[PDB]
Amino acid sequence: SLTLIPDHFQHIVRLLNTNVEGKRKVPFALRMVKGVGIRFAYLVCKKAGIDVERRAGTLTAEELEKIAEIIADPAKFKIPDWFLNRQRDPKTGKTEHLSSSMVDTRLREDLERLKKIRAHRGVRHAYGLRVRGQHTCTTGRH
């Protein structure tokens, strides 16, 4: 951005237990953590006051600690309720938004919930089969 590189520019920064390529732009490297994506990483850069032009390795430690609590607790920052991943959360009831290690954790807890009871959508994951209304005659091929 016609500005010189800083002395502290990490090529890989680590946020939410995830390696993040600091050579990228700031939202598009902030989508590398699970649960974020492009449409939400522009809201983390907007609520943190981070310019979207800057590269992700120039984010200092006080800027990365502000990002990680926008992602862990987004409803305190008026990111709206419809924007979140886990909104009505059966067996909890509360709206959440799942971070890096938590997306894959509660995904396994949802596939175990539907397999404890013998619900058909949990029986499809036990056999490895397709879950939605796909035909799976000519296109599985795994």
Partner: protein, 110 residues
């Protein structure tokens, strides 16, 4: 156990207008489209077997019924299409149709 942040004792209490606000969107649409529609006799004969003592297995063809907390603890024998599959309604089954618990096919083994 818990369903949408309520145990089985708050679940039973809850009104049918407030339970409709609790469930997911397909279940609450089924409930709004059966507000004045003379409920199925599966629900009536389900509590007539509950009073005695698992209770007796009541048989049905109904598979588009949403499981309510009033159905919890009652064995339903759901018809897949050629037999009756005996399924005890545990508390984690709230909101799911009865057809999700009796497969109408066998998993294929080659």
């Amino acid at each position: 156990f818990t369903y949408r942040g309520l145990e089985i004792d708050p679940l039973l209490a809850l009104s049918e207008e407030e339970f409709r606000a609790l469930v997911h969107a397909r279940a609450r649409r089924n409930m709004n489209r059966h507000v004045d529609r003379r409920p199925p006799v599966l629900l009536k004969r389900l509590r007539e077997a509950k009073k005695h003592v698992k209770p007796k297995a009541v048989k049905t063809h109904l598979r588009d019924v949403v499981i309510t907390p009033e159905m919890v603890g009652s064995v339903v024998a759901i018809y897949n299409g050629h037999q009756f599959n005996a399924v005890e309604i545990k508390g984690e089954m709230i909101g799911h149709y009865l057809g999700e618990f009796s497969m109408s096919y066998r998993p294929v083994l080659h």
